[PDB]
Design a protein around this ligand. Structure first.
Ligand SMILES: [Ca+2]
Length: 244
């Protein structure tokens, strides 16, 4: 199935390992799942980030094919484990990908896609926050555009604390800046900007939901020396519209 809406709170699940088949059954599709890192812990989904690893090698990186549309939103809760090792940062939670879904060192400059994802991040100065991480047509750098935004705007986020995340995305048209990228955390606006995602209309649609939980970054210094855990809950996905 290619869902256009999803509602998953994992409350019908036993504490214990969450298999690929469970994920495919709930999400409809999940083509990267590593059941070794997905575990239902007390009615929530715990993802494992393994020590001494980056990317898929140590985390869980799945793209859920959703019904194509121009307007999408999702909601979920996320909590870092009690002794989570912040390290440098990484990707967290549920986002969206338009067109070719640009990520990696591949900027949206070719006008063929981007992504709306979210990261946690630690500064050399010791602050730790959430931050948008957007590839799009006009990102200033080769890697993810944060738009200079962080949550909280001052101070750090805390371990063992549940944060509700709302994400809203809207396709642009042609070469116009009529799209939208929005992140709302605990009802507070983190990012709410108009945006140009694509200049190729054949790639303008929101195509799938990203579920990325991994450290990095690309270099070995984004790694952590310990296993760490992140917990998600109460995922609500909704296709608001498809409009050509
Ligand atoms: Ca739950």
């Amino acid at each position: 199935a290619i869902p256009s809406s999803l509602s998953i709170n994992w409350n019908n699940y036993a504490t214990g390992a969450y298999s690929s088949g469970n994920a495919a059954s709930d999400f409809g599709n999940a083509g990267g799942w590593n059941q070794s890192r997905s575990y239902i812990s007390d009615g929530t989904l715990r993802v494992t980030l393994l020590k001494n690893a980056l990317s898929g090698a140590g985390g869980l990186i799945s793209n859920i094919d959703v019904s194509d549309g121009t307007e999408y939103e999702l909601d979920y809760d996320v909590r870092f484990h009690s002794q989570f090792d912040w390290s440098r940062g990484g990707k967290v939670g549920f986002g969206f990908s338009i067109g070719e879904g640009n990520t990696g060192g591949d900027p949206g400059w070719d006008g063929n896609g981007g992504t709306l994802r979210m990261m946690w991040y630690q500064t050399d100065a010791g602050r730790v926050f959430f931050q948008p991480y957007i590839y799009h047509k006009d990102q200033p750098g080769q890697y993810g555009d944060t738009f200079g935004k962080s949550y909280p705007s001052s101070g750090s986020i805390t371990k063992g604390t549940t944060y509700h995340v709302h994400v809203y995305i809207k396709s642009n048209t042609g070469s116009n800046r009529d799209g939208r990228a929005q992140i709302i955390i605990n009802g507070t606006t983190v990012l709410d900007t108009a945006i140009r995602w694509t200049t190729n209309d054949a790639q303008r649609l929101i195509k799938n939901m990203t579920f990325h939980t991994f450290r990095g970054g690309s270099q070995t210094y984004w790694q952590s020396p310990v296993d760490s855990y992140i917990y998600y809950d109460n995922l609500v996905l909704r296709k608001i519209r498809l409009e050509h």
